[PDB]
Design a protein around this ligand. Structure first.
Ligand SMILES: O=P(O)(O)O[C@H]1[C@H](OP(=O)(O)O)[C@@H](OP(=O)(O)O)[C@H](OP(=O)(O)O)[C@@H](OP(=O)(O)O)[C@H]1OP(=O)(O)O
Ligand code: NA
Length: 205
């Protein structure tokens, strides 16, 4: 598949990020979150920085590469406790009948294994004993339009197969993140809209 160009190799060669905290972020149900940046694309890095700005006091941005090497590019992993969210940021690619099949070059199965290894490596190198309760998939069209099939479904299941029983929110449409770290999706007329529930599904066991 010959989609948008991809830079997921070698985290040390990636651009760093600047997180400008927001003032209108409000409250989150997660005591902490990891924003996991899955590729070096400028738009992905910006989206990742923007999301962190929404809950700056309780967010860590990690960049994780195709070798499983990672680096913290914002925040303090030590400060993480309680109910956690992961927001995965990258480009969806390789469209099909059930929408995109790969996030940042990874199939749902391959991504699950990466994150399972990452969880293990991260928790031991940063002295933490905390897993995610939720994974928000911040990439375009990674679940079928009817919400029944696609990457999202394959992913939640493969995560469970790799030791991680999580909830998964995932979008069936094009996705953008604004400067305030808020998600936008596209409507029928192809306009950017906010909180369009027919553009997302929350998968739960
Ligand atoms: O409380 P809001 O300002 O409306 O923000 C919500 C909230 O995000 P926060 O935790 O940052 O508040 C949702 O988190 P949940 O507790 O519902 O999980 C998130 O949903 P996801 O976790 O699935 O991303 C949703 O995003 P969406 O627009 O996709 O509904 C997002 O709204 P914003 O996009 O306005 O930040
Ligand atoms: Na909120």
């Amino acid at each position: 598949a010959d989609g948008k160009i991809l830079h997921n190799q070698n985290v040390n060669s990636w651009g760093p990020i600047t997180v400008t905290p927001t003032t209108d972020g409000g409250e989150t149900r997660f005591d902490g979150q990891i924003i996991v940046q899955m590729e070096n694309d400028p738009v992905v890095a910006k989206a990742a920085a923007n999301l962190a700005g929404k809950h700056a006091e309780s967010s860590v941005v990690v960049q994780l590469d195709s070798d499983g090497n990672y680096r913290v590019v914002y925040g303090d992993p030590s400060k993480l406790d309680g109910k956690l969210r992961w927001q995965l940021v990258g480009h969806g690619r390789d469209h099909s009948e059930t929408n995109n099949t790969r996030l940042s070059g990874y199939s749902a199965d391959e991504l699950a294994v990466k994150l399972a290894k990452f969880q293990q490596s991260f928790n031991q190198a940063e002295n933490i004993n905390n897993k995610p309760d939720h994974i928000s998939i911040v990439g375009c069209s990674l679940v079928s339009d009817d919400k029944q099939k696609g990457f999202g479904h394959q992913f939640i299941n493969a995560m469970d197969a790799n030791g991680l029983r999580v909830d998964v929110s995932v979008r069936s449409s094009e996705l953008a993140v604004d400067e305030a770290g808020r998600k936008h999706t596209k409507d029928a007329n192809g306009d950017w809209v906010q909180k369009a529930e027919n553009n997302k599904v929350s998968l739960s066991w």
